Amino acid sequence: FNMXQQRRFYXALH
Amino acid sequence: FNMXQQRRFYXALH
Amino acid sequence: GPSVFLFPPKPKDTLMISRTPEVTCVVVDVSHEDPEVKFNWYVDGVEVHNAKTKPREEQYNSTYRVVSVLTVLHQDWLNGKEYKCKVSNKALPAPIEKTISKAKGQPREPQVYTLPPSREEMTKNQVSLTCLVKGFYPSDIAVEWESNGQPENNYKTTPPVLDSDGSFFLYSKLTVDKSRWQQGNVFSCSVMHEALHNHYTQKSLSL
Amino acid sequence: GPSVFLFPPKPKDTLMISRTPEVTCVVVDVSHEDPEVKFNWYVDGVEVHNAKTKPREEQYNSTYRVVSVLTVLHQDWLNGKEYKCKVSNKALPAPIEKTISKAKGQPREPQVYTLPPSREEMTKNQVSLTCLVKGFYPSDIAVEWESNGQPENNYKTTPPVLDSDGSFFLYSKLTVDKSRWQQGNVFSCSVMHEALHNHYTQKSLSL
Ligand SMILES: *[C@@H]1O[C@H](CO)[C@@H](O[C@@H]2O[C@H](CO)[C@@H](O[C@@H]3O[C@H](CO[C@H]4O[C@H](CO)[C@@H](O)[C@H](O)[C@@H]4O[C@@H]4O[C@H](CO)[C@@H](O[C@@H]5O[C@H](CO)[C@H](O)[C@H](O)[C@H]5O)[C@H](O)[C@H]4NC(C)=O)[C@@H](O)[C@H](O[C@H]4O[C@H](CO)[C@@H](O)[C@H](O)[C@@H]4O)[C@@H]3O)[C@H](O)[C@H]2NC(C)=O)[C@H](O)[C@H]1NC(C)=O
Numbered sequence: 001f002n003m004x005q006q007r008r009f010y011x012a013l014h
Numbered sequence: 015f016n017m018x019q020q021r022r023f024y025x026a027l028h
Numbered sequence: 029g030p031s032v033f034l035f036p037p038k039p040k041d042t043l044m045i046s047r048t049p050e051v052t053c054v055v056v057d058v059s060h061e062d063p064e065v066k067f068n069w070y071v072d073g074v075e076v077h078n079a080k081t082k083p084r085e086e087q088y089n090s091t092y093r094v095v096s097v098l099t100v101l102h103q104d105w106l107n108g109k110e111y112k113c114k115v116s117n118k119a120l121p122a123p124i125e126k127t128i129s130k131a132k133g134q135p136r137e138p139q140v141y142t143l144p145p146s147r148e149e150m151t152k153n154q155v156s157l158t159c160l161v162k163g164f165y166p167s168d169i170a171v172e173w174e175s176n177g178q179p180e181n182n183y184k185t186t187p188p189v190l191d192s193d194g195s196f197f198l199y200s201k202l203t204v205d206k207s208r209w210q211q212g213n214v215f216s217c218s219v220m221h222e223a224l225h226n227h228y229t230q231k232s233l234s235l
Numbered sequence: 236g237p238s239v240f241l242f243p244p245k246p247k248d249t250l251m252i253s254r255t256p257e258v259t260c261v262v263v264d265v266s267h268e269d270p271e272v273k274f275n276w277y278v279d280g281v282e283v284h285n286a287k288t289k290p291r292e293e294q295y296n297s298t299y300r301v302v303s304v305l306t307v308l309h310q311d312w313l314n315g316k317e318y319k320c321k322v323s324n325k326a327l328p329a330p331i332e333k334t335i336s337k338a339k340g341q342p343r344e345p346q347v348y349t350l351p352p353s354r355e356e357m358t359k360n361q362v363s364l365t366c367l368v369k370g371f372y373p374s375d376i377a378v379e380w381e382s383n384g385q386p387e388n389n390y391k392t393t394p395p396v397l398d399s400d401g402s403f404f405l406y407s408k409l410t411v412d413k414s415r416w417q418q419g420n421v422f423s424c425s426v427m428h429e430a431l432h433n434h435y436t437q438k439s440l441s442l
């Protein structure tokens with residue numbers, strides 16, 4: 001999977 | 015547990 | 029009458045933005061004579077209309093089974109919204125209703141430890157690589173293995189087990205040809221859970 | 236009407252001659268108004284009269300629960316005899332009947348491997364000692380831990396997990412103060428199963 005997209009998702013979750 | 019009784023049990027099972 | 033069961037998304041699918049999480053409503057014991065079933069879906073009380081209902085399917089016991097699937101948002105499921113499936117069929121007195129949401133309780137972060145195969149297992153052609161995952165809450169978790177960029181599929185994982193402090197642990201077992209272990213190939217256990225940073229962590233294991 | 240559930244002996248109790256194995260018949264959803272329940276027991280069709288029936292007990296949901304216990308012979312249970320419990324109560328149309336016996340299938344011997352705690356777990360005050368048990372059939376098994384002659388109780392064991400060849404594996408986790416591991420104390424994982432010699436094997440684990 002795309003790690004940079006996962007990181008952006010987690011940072012933006014709220 | 016008693017190991018010698020367990021061994022006798024297993025040897026005599028039939 | 030028919031019976032309704034309502035199923036959550038796979039843990040991984042809720043945690044990883046590459047995936048699409050879905051909630052699944054299964055209607056069983058639907059009779060040959062009346063097999064018409066309607067579904068209605070709601071999120072925190074508000075009706076939603078994006079569900080996709082499958083065509084009915086007969087069973088090997090003369091009855092039907094009908095399945096509806098709802099795609100949900102990761103963040104919604106993770107932030108505790110509630111999902112309700114309502115099922116309608118003539119052979120019911122009234123519609124059956126079922127609701128689900130993410131397990132509740134204070135989250136705790138998994139600790140992940142890799143354990144090499146025992147010396148005594150080397151008499152064998154295949155060996156066991158172990159990943160211990162402990163101290164996590166809630167029990168929803170996903171565990172995978174890789175090597176050299178690519179997934180390894182020859183693993184089995186125990187269910188989560190309640191530990192003495194009320195947290196959970198499990199073990200995952202990857203079975204590999206002894207060759208590959210002894211050649212020095214690098215393996216990794218990857219763990220996905222809500223209380224990890226990025227929802228993801230990976231630990232290596234090698235000779 | 237009432238409902239009847241019938242339970243096998245604990246694996247250890249069937250395997251170890253120091254123990255007394257018993258089969259347990261539980262009757263639930265017995266009403267306040269008619270709580271009289273009779274039990275009859277049979278072994279390979281032949282009635283036996285050594286069961287001991289408990290006094291009825293009320294539940295927190297207005298209903299009763301009645302339990303009968305039958306002591307059985309180790310060798311009989313192990314050699315595949317069948318145990319039948321018949322339950323009688325006025326609120327039934329007819330007596331309910333339930334039968335059990337040892338899981339069937341070709342037995343295979345467990346392989347037992349001990350795994351020390353990870354280096355990365357040493358930052359902690361307590362550490363995890365692991366026992367991997369694999370390749371066994373049927374799934375009925377017991378696992379314990381000792382040290383210096385005496386039982387260690389601070390362990391948890393996963394359920395048996397089906398492996399890719401149709402055999403079973405599990406892992407047991409003993410949690411110990413890091414002190415004791417580092418002092419060089421010797422621990423053992425003990426495993427009881429029908430397909431082991433003596434029904435018993437023990438593997439050591441230490442620094
Ligand atoms: C006539 O024949 C029919 C059909 O053969 C029978 O129907 C069965 O009736 C049973 C009794 O009424 C019913 O039992 C309940 O089971 C559930 C658990 O069901 C799951 O696990 C089973 C395997 O152990 C499977 O058979 C089921 O299919 C089900 O599997 C899950 O399905 C999910 C939906 O697809 C799926 O999740 C989705 O998957 C997709 C991708 O595949 C996506 O990821 C998506 O995101 C997900 O949402 C799961 O992965 C999948 N899981 C699997 C395969 O493991 C159980 O919870 C329930 O428990 C109730 O009762 C207990 C007992 O007291 C109580 O403790 C509980 O609280 C609860 O109230 C029941 O035991 C069977 O499920 C059902 N068969 C079906 C649905 O196929 C009829 O009964 C027969 N008629 C008779 C006898 O008269």
Ligand SMILES: *[C@@H]1O[C@H](CO)[C@@H](O[C@@H]2O[C@H](CO)[C@@H](O[C@@H]3O[C@H](CO[C@H]4O[C@H](CO)[C@@H](O)[C@H](O)[C@@H]4O[C@@H]4O[C@H](CO)[C@@H](O[C@@H]5O[C@H](CO)[C@H](O)[C@H](O)[C@H]5O)[C@H](O)[C@H]4NC(C)=O)[C@@H](O)[C@H](O[C@H]4O[C@H](CO)[C@@H](O)[C@H](O)[C@@H]4O)[C@@H]3O)[C@H](O)[C@H]2NC(C)=O)[C@H](O)[C@H]1NC(C)=O
Pocket residue numbers: 238240242243244245248256257258259261263264294296298300
């Ligand atoms: C009103 O209130 C009563 C009582 O509170 C309710 O009664 C309950 O009804 C349930 C539904 O009818 C019923 O569900 C079934 O459960 C069994 C599994 O039960 C075991 O595990 C449960 C915990 O998960 C326990 O609650 C049970 O007590 C039971 O525990 C076991 O008990 C054994 C006998 O003592 C014991 O073995 C012995 O132990 C001694 C020493 O202690 C010796 O070693 C001896 O050798 C042994 O023989 C076990 O150790 C012990 N195990 C434990 C504690 O884990 C389940 O199998 C069954 O499944 C049926 O249905 C499913 C679902 O589809 C199907 O898949 C299966 O094929 C099967 O047909 C049921 O789910 C509850 O058990 C029961 N409660 C009881 C008995 O206390 C009423 O229902 C309520 N009224 C209502 C709601 O109207």
